[PDB]
Amino acid sequence: NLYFQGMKKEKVEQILAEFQLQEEDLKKVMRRMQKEMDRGLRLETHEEASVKMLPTYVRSTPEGSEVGDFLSLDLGGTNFRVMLVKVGEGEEGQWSVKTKHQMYSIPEDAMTGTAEMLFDYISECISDFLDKHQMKHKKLPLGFTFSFPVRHEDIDKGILLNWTKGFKASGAEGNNVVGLLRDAIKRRGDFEMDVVAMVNDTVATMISCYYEDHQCEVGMIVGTGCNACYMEEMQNVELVEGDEGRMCVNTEWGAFGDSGELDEFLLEYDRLVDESSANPGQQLYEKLIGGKYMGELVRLVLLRLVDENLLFHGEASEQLRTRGAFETRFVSQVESDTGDRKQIYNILSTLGLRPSTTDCDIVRRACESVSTRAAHMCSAGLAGVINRMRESRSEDVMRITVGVDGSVYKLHPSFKERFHASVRRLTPSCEITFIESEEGSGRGAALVSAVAC
Ligand SMILES: OC[C@H]1O[C@H](O)[C@H](O)[C@@H](O)[C@@H]1O
Ligand SMILES: [K+]
DSSP states (O other), X not given: OHHHHHHHHHHHHHHHGGGOOOHHHHHHHXXXXXXXXXXXXXXXXXXXXXXXXXXXXXXSOOOOOOOEEEEEEEESSSEXXXXXXXXXXXXXXXXXXXXXXXXXXXOHHHHSSBHHHHHHHHHHHHHHHHHHTXXXXXXXXXXXXXXXXXXXXXXXXXEEOOOOTTOOOBTOBTSBHHHHHHHHHHHHXXXXXXXXXXXXXXXXXXXXXXXXXXXXXXXXXXXXXEEEEEEEXXXXXXXXXXXXXXXXXXXXXXXXXXXXXXGGGOOHHHHHHHHTSSSTTSSTTGGXXXXXXXXXXXXXXXXXXXXXXXXGGGOOOTTTTSTTXXXXXXXXXXXXXXXXXXXXXXXXXXXXXXXXXXXXXXXXHHHHHHHHHHHHHHHHHHHHHHHHHHHHTTOSSEEEEEXXXXXXXXXXXXXXXXXXXXXXXXXTTEEEEEEEOSSHHHHHHHHHHHHHO
């Protein structure tokens, strides 16, 4: 019965309508975000603020710079990346180019063991890399892209406030991250490095986009996690001395909602994802968006649909009932389907399911709902930052460039398009250019290191 397939699809639509956010909902989220951002910048409310607005000590005038060979480290995902990057004088300023690169999978027992284990592993990887390229012992300036909330005292010194994205290594929170890295390198003792700069991935991304676009003063990550940085007026950065020029601020907007600010928008699936995560009650805005959580959100929606007898004859496979089994890349692949249902079919088949045609269509709709809410929620955050910037500055029309990295933004067929449209609706009187970084974290880390060096 085509009539009863259609009836199944109308029921699915009623359940899926819960993910809708209206323009006014997004404006409410945006205003709330802006409020928390104000609170994060002020000495009086900083400690209470869920959105920390952390000074990076990356400034508008980095005085000068330096050229030569730079090593970049990137820790923040399931993979740890080492690369050699060359920084050199161009016609606009410094260019940077990725030349030798290697990536290492972090063992499970290193991300959730002790900080000694984690940083020992990192030091081992740095040795392996320097071996493969004979650039060993030698001393090189090292830039560390370290994609977790850090309270900086300077560019080369900052403490880990808390792990995010499933990181749980004991003995790291409250300690100087550069210190933890130097200590581990010294314990191995088979090379020496000049640790010159530590930066957030958002910041690395913004920096890497400058040489090509000097209007880039926002960096955004929509990958495993979700965060943004931007160039704030020094007069508004109350935690740092001085009123002149600008400093990059790491919003850590992922923790937005951790004081209840998103409560009316959270769905059962969100509560379930939060509760089975490594950091329950934390990073709640990020959990609506980030790749670490998106596929899992879809899996939970599909389980609700099977339990309602609307999908897969009401039976869920072992794989479908396995945590993390619906990968976030499957969300993108499903929404890449050209209409013949082939891509969707093959995903669900490899998950042990026997999908029908309408099963495939419902799974598409489930993915679209989760990823569209992610796009819309993210848009409210970026719009809040950009509207903030426009007001802080002297601008009837603000023209700004946003530098972006992360697999969700880059590889999802329609996230990007839905995101841009929503951001534009919320930012009248702004002309926003989006740029995707190419090796943003590696080249960014090198460029900041060149300045600090
Ligand atoms: O990797 C993207 C983001 O993931 C997380 O939210 C971290 O807290 C943040 O530092 C980072 O920028
Ligand atoms: K200040």
